[PDB]
Design a protein around this ligand. Structure first.
Ligand SMILES: [Mg+2]
Ligand SMILES: [Mg+2]
Ligand SMILES: [Mg+2]
Ligand SMILES: [Mg+2]
Ligand SMILES: [Mg+2]
Ligand SMILES: [Mg+2]
Ligand SMILES: [Mg+2]
Ligand SMILES: [Mg+2]
Ligand SMILES: [Mg+2]
Ligand SMILES: [Mg+2]
Ligand SMILES: [Mg+2]
Ligand SMILES: [Mg+2]
Ligand SMILES: [Mg+2]
Ligand SMILES: [Mg+2]
Ligand SMILES: [Mg+2]
Ligand SMILES: [Mg+2]
Ligand SMILES: [Mg+2]
Ligand SMILES: [Mg+2]
Ligand SMILES: [Mg+2]
Ligand SMILES: [Mg+2]
Ligand SMILES: [Mg+2]
Ligand SMILES: [Mg+2]
Ligand SMILES: [Mg+2]
Ligand SMILES: [Mg+2]
Ligand SMILES: [Mg+2]
Ligand SMILES: [Mg+2]
Lengths: 46, 26, 124, 97, 41, 141, 217, 178, 202
RNA sequence: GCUAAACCUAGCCCCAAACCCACUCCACCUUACUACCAGACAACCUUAGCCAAACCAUUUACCCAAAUAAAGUAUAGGCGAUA
RNA sequence: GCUACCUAAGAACAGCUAAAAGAGCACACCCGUCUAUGUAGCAAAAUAGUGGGAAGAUUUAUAGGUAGAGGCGACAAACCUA
RNA sequence: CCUCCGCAUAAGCCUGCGUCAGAUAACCAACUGACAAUUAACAGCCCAAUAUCUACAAUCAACCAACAAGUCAUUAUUACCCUCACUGUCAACCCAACACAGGCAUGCUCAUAAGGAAAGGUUAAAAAAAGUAAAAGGAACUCGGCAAAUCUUACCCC
């Protein structure tokens, strides 16, 4: 009907989908961390 | 800031002319 | 959306995370048999407090004390000032060898000693 | 407004110092030094710019050919992109074709 | 930026001078007067 | 101690002992009215009620009956000129129910030259009456 | 109200701790007021201390320099020479003399001196003044001057530049002994009560009455 | 029992409290050991009292009388800890020849950023536990690119710094004749 | 503290200093000639002579010094005037306030000659520091000054929380080689029959 | 007359030369920054394509180890573009 | 983390007929037939009324899964963070 | 005068209308600075091993009655001293760019003991929106009984 409410928050789903451990388990998830520390972002993962 | 002072000199001349027109001495 | 810069904490999560996270408090016991906890007097710390009876020292020092040039302690100085007397007297009077070194004081094997030095068991 | 109200500080220009008095010296060293040296090894500068002139393409190709292995990643990347763009520009674009 | 114009004020203000007596926003603004001063000339 | 590794105890082993502790406590006046026997402390996030019990019993030699624990959240609302959030440090709190008849109460602490020259000048100064008409009160004529 | 508002707002501050000290050149107030009449050994000891701290010092020449300093300070007021006026006047005497005259000029000329200026008494300060000392002298002066005050717009508030009027005052000078660079400078005035009031102003004046907050009385 | 959380009540409401000089690490070295163990608890009690005074002062919205007293006792305890840690350092280096008093080793992480990984206390061996095996102390080839990139970045920052300080010296030597 | 900070007359942390230099302010820096601590030869309390600026050709006593800006604060010299009273209703009593002065602007003085004479930074034969005068050499001593930490080291009295000098200086150390914890244990008289068992480390 | 306007520093770019980094107080691969228990789980693969060829389908420069020159020669190529 | 579909283990469904029901009236609940308003709106798809179903092929909270040369789909070329 | 909302739990954010001072639809402040605060029994944070046992739904579970065939248990042996620690506990709060007329599972209340205020003031022009009432006629308007009103029959295509 009406949009905008796509983000129904859940900390569990968040930490599982965009988590340090998932990023470190998948190889490309290490490449994102490296690109991000190279740019200098404070939060390397979520 | 823009470099150069020839234009600043010309503008000082115009400013002092305007000042004389505004409050000319006797 | 959610905040990233704010540090993850026990407050933020659901029941499970709120219960499992912990705010840095160290362990004291274990948990078994229907959430029954068990602490132990061997894992509990025991503050060792001496009596202050007949105690002269005071937390602050008067300005009358003279300034002293700094001499940081070190191993060579310690050995030369503490053990060298025994070593040299036993040398020039009796006889010794690399053996009989525990007499002068030395732990060739650390374990078997209560207070280990590396890895050190005690704290501070 | 872009013009400035007050004048800037007057430039001090010492027309007589080390470089301005010694300027151009030892430029004919080859001509009146029994040709022991050419003036092109005199200039202090990059290794790929020493007695050599060229346009953008020539300069970038010379850079990557001579000192390209010592280049940083982003620098070599954008250099190759530059020479690619300049190749197709100089060869396809403009009048006189 | 290495080469920038400093006398734009004067080069526009001579035209503004010629255009002072005009009516409306022409006398004040520049692009509106440029279309008019050449016409007056 | 805080920020110090403990020795892992396993069955039939020695007993853990602290000699030079590092934990520091903040006796504070409460904002809410606790009973007379109660005391309130502000302490680090690492301490707990049992080690605080041993602490008070050994250091200050005071009998302690019960202890409750709380955590307070430092407000992360403040923002600098950079719009970066400033967080106040968190702190744990310890509510100590005292022994048989201690009945503690937080006591009162704060019940009770150029400056002299300044006040001398001030009490020497006299305000010009309106009859003067804004004239300086200096000249004689 | 400063401390109360500070505590209520939360602007808690520590005392200013610093080795530096605020140095001054004139003590506030006076040590001894020569209450004039309706018309001693202490001063002798004072002069002895003055001579001790500063051997090069005479008394009978003091009234001349005093009158000179007076008239030249008034000329400096006319000319607006505030730098030398400061060098010759103390920080206590500068405000009351130069505060209200802002937004307006002034005219003051010295016609003559009917009676010669005469020393009245001398006082010396105790050592407990920030580890320094200051000496005071009092001098009666009886002369004839003119005064004329034009406001912002150049119209006279009162006084006339042509007609002088006899005038009597008791001026007080003081000097810093600890430093050698200090010189005698005007400090204050006594304005005794028994003296008559000066000439009023040509303009008429009113005052606002008690403003009755909305409740009669 | 609890008055030791507060100074002498006659000092209450006083703006300036007397306080002595700080402790000297040389003095603590020269002194004994159990004397230092006792002085530790002395300084602990004093520090608790001072911090209670500070917090109550902030509560009442007033300043404290003697602020430097606090950092005095703090630096005293700091020098004490330093002296004792130096004693045990020398003792360890005499017995074994170890300086850090906690096992560690240089190891390369998956990010290629080699670091001094320290050791924890474990009951079962590393080859039998499963949690430790996942830490994956090694980097793969694709990380060398990013390592080179961060190296280039460090080079850029460093070169910028040197050029800037050279410019500073140049401009000040230009302005000043010398 | 922030970079490119301005060390004005007021000290750090003071209300005036923080209102003059808030955290967000970013003004131009100040160009000060480099001056090493070895080359520095100006200490507080020393007599100094000035020959330019306001009140040129005078001498006085240094009140303090700012080593960052190479500034000197002399009492009663180079003084402007400022009000201090509450300007809301009271006018504000006037008082003199000193100005800073540069080391190149100020000159030192000999105690005997009381004249401006340049300085050199030598080592006396007995060692190991001396400040010497120009053509006619005179050794220049340092000015005496009350340290800020202790208001008086001579007129000092031992408080209750202060320890005696004899107790502070007297040493009771014993090079026993023994561990602190163990020596504390046997000083208490306590013992523990249980031996610490081995554990892994990784 | 207001709104406004002006400034000159912070610093940065290209080169040269020179090789370069790590609290060693606690914590950080489980939901990273979380003191503490039995898993057997490990990587080694042609770059492609846009575009040019006036469409497109073979093809179409992109470094890898001395600057210049030989030489844009020998050669290759829907023997065309081009290499 | 919306959505299409699925997995694990859960929850909701008044009252009245019928008394068996992929049955009927009808709240909650789900959906969105019709009308008007609104159209930079209360809203980047809503509001009032009227409407279909509402013990089932029902609705729905929670954690997980299927990833684009693809998934999923009671095929509308639907849906896969406006 | 309303209340179809409320209370609380879960989920979610994280100090976000508590005290004190301040200037700054109306500025109680929901804005800034300091101070305090939410105290576990409630809920999370668990289970030594080996082998072994575990056909018979629920629906008041009784009868009847089935189909879509269903959410629950131990046992023998070995080892087994101690004890109650840690973590959430606030709010006018969540996702929709907003203090949004929108969306939001669960237990109780089913008209409230709880929670709220449609009208800033005046006049009562047009046009417009939402309703109420209407003489006689009662679809003649209209593409069409759209809408409103009332409770109504019969027949076709798919
Ligand atoms: Mg969005
Ligand atoms: Mg959902
Ligand atoms: Mg975000
Ligand atoms: Mg709790
Ligand atoms: Mg192809
Ligand atoms: Mg049905
Ligand atoms: Mg139905
Ligand atoms: Mg329809
Ligand atoms: Mg429809
Ligand atoms: Mg149905
Ligand atoms: Mg039913
Ligand atoms: Mg179809
Ligand atoms: Mg179609
Ligand atoms: Mg419980
Ligand atoms: Mg709650
Ligand atoms: Mg919904
Ligand atoms: Mg109510
Ligand atoms: Mg209203
Ligand atoms: Mg309205
Ligand atoms: Mg209205
Ligand atoms: Mg009708
Ligand atoms: Mg009909
Ligand atoms: Mg019709
Ligand atoms: Mg019809
Ligand atoms: Mg029709
Ligand atoms: Mg209808």
């Amino acid at each position: 009907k009406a949009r905008g409410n796509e983000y129904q928050p859940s900390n569990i789903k968040r930490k599982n989908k965009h988590g340090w451990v998932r990023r470190l388990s998948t190889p490309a998830g290490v490449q994102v961390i490296l690109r991000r520390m190279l740019k200098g972002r404070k939060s390397l993962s979520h | 800031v823009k470099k150069g002072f020839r234009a600043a000199f010309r503008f000082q001349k115009e400013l002092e002319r305007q000042r004389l027109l505004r409050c000319p001495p006797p | 959306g959610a905040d990233r810069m704010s540090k993850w904490t026990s407050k933020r999560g659901p029941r499970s995370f709120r219960g499992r996270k912990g705010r840095g408090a160290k362990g004291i016991g274990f948990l078994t048999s229907g959430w029954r906890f068990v602490q132990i007097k061997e894992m509990v710390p025991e503050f060792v407090v001496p009596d202050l009876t007949g105690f002269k020292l005071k937390p602050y020092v008067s300005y009358l004390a003279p300034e002293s040039e700094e001499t940081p302690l070190t191993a060579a100085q310690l050995f030369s000032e503490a053990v060298a007397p025994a070593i040299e007297k036993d040398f020039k009077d009796g006889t010794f060898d690399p053996d009989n070194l525990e007499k002068y004081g030395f732990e060739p094997t650390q374990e078997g000693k209560l207070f280990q030095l590396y890895p050190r068991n005690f704290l501070r | 407004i872009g013009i400035r109200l007050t004048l800037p500080p007057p430039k001090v220009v010492d027309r007589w110092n080390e470089k301005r008095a010694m300027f151009g010296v030892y430029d004919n060293i080859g001509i009146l030094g029994n040709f022991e040296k050419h003036p092109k090894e005199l200039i202090r500068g990059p290794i790929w710019l020493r007695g050599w002139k060229g346009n953008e393409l020539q300069r970038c190709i010379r850079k990557r050919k001579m000192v390209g292995s010592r280049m940083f990643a982003d620098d070599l990347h954008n250099l190759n992109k530059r020479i690619r763009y300049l190749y197709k520009h100089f060869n396809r674009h403009g009048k006189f074709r | 930026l290495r080469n920038r114009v400093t006398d734009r004020y004067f080069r526009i203000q001579e035209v503004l001078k010629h255009a002072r007596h005009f009516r409306g926003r022409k006398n004040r603004c520049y692009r509106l007067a440029v279309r008019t001063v050449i016409r007056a000339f | 101690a805080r920020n110090v590794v403990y020795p892992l105890y396993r069955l039939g082993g020695p007993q853990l002992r602290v000699f030079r502790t590092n934990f520091f406590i903040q006796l504070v006046r409460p904002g809410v009215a606790q009973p007379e026997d109660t005391v309130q402390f502000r302490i680090p996030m690492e301490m707990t009620r049992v080690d605080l019990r041993n602490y008070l019993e050994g250091i200050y030699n005071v009998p302690v009956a019960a202890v409750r624990t709380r955590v307070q959240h430092g407000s992360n609302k403040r923002r600098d000129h950079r719009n970066v959030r400033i967080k106040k440090p968190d702190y744990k709190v310890a509510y100590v129910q005292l022994a048989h008849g201690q009945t503690f109460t937080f006591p009162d602490l704060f019940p009770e030259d150029l400056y002299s020259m300044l006040e001398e000048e001030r009490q020497q100064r006299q305000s010009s009456d309106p009859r003067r008409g804004g004239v300086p009160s200096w000249f004689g004529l | 109200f400063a401390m109360q508002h500070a505590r209520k707002a939360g602007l808690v501050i520590p005392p200013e701790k610093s080795d530096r000290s605020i140095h001054l050149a004139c003590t506030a107030g006076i040590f001894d007021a020569y209450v004039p009449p309706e018309g001693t050994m202490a001063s002798q000891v004072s002069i002895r201390r003055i001579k001790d701290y500063d051997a090069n010092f005479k008394i009978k020449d003091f009234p001349e320099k005093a009158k000179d300093i007076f008239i030249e300070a008034h000329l400096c007021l006319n000319n607006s020479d505030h730098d030398r006026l400061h060098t010759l006047v103390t920080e206590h005497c500068f405000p009351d003399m130069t505060w209200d005259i802002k937004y307006k000029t002034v005219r003051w000329s010295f016609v003559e001196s009917l009676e010669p200026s005469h020393v009245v008494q001398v006082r010396c300060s105790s050592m407990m003044n920030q580890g320094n000392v200051y000496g005071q002298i009092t001098v009666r002066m009886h002369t004839r001057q003119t005064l004329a005050i034009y406001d912002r717009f150049g119209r006279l508030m009162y006084g006339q530049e042509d007609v002088p009027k006899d005038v009597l005052e008791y001026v007080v000078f003081e000097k810093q002994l600890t430093n050698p660079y200090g010189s005698w400078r005007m400090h204050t005035k006594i304005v005794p009560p028994w003296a008559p009031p000066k000439q009023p102003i040509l303009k008429t004046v009113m005052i606002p009455g008690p403003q009755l907050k909305p409740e009669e009385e | 029992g609890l008055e030791e959380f507060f100074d002498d009540p006659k000092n209450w409401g006083q703006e300036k409290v007397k306080s002595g000089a700080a402790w000297t690490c040389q003095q603590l070295r020269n002194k004994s050991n159990e004397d230092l163990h006792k002085l530790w608890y002395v300084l602990l009690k004093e520090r608790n009292m001072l911090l209670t005074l500070e917090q109550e002062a902030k509560r009442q919205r007033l300043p404290m009388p003697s602020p430097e007293r606090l950092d005095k006792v703090v630096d005293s305890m700091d020098a004490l800890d330093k002296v004792v840690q130096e004693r045990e350092d020398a003792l360890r280096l005499l017995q074994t020849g170890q300086e850090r008093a906690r096992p560690g080793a240089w190891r390369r992480d998956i990010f290629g950023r080699i670091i001094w990984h320290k050791f924890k206390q474990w009951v079962i061996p590393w080859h039998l536990n499963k949690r430790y095996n996942r830490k994956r102390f090694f980097a793969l080839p694709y990380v060398d690119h990013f390592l080179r990139l961060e190296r280039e970045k460090r080079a850029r920052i460093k070169a910028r710094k040197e050029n800037l300080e050279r410019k500073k010296a140049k401009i000040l030597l230009k302005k000043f004749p010398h | 503290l922030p970079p490119h900070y301005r060390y004005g007359m007021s000290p750090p942390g003071s209300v005036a200093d923080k209102r003059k230099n808030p955290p967000w302010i970013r003004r131009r820096p100040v160009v000060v000639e480099p001056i090493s601590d070895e080359d520095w030869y100006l200490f507080c309390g020393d007599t100094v002579e000035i020959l330019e600026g306001k009140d040129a050709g005078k001498q006085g006593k240094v009140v303090q010094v700012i080593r960052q800006r190479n500034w000197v604060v002399v009492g009663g010299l180079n003084t402007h005037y400022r009000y201090i009273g509450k300007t809301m209703d009271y006018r504000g009593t006037m008082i003199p306030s000193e100005a800073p002065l540069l080391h190149r602007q100020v000159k030192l003085v000999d105690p005997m000659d009381r004249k401006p004479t340049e300085i050199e930074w030598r080592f006396t034969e007995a060692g190991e520091r001396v400040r010497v005068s120009t053509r006619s050499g005179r050794i220049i001593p340092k000015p005496e000054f009350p340290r800020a930490d202790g208001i008086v080291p001579e007129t000092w009295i031992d408080g209750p929380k202060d320890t005696s000098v004899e107790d502070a200086l007297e040493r009771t150390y014993v090079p026993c080689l023994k561990t602190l914890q163990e020596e504390v244990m046997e000083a208490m008289g306590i013992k523990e029959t249980r031996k610490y068992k081995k554990v892994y480390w990784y």
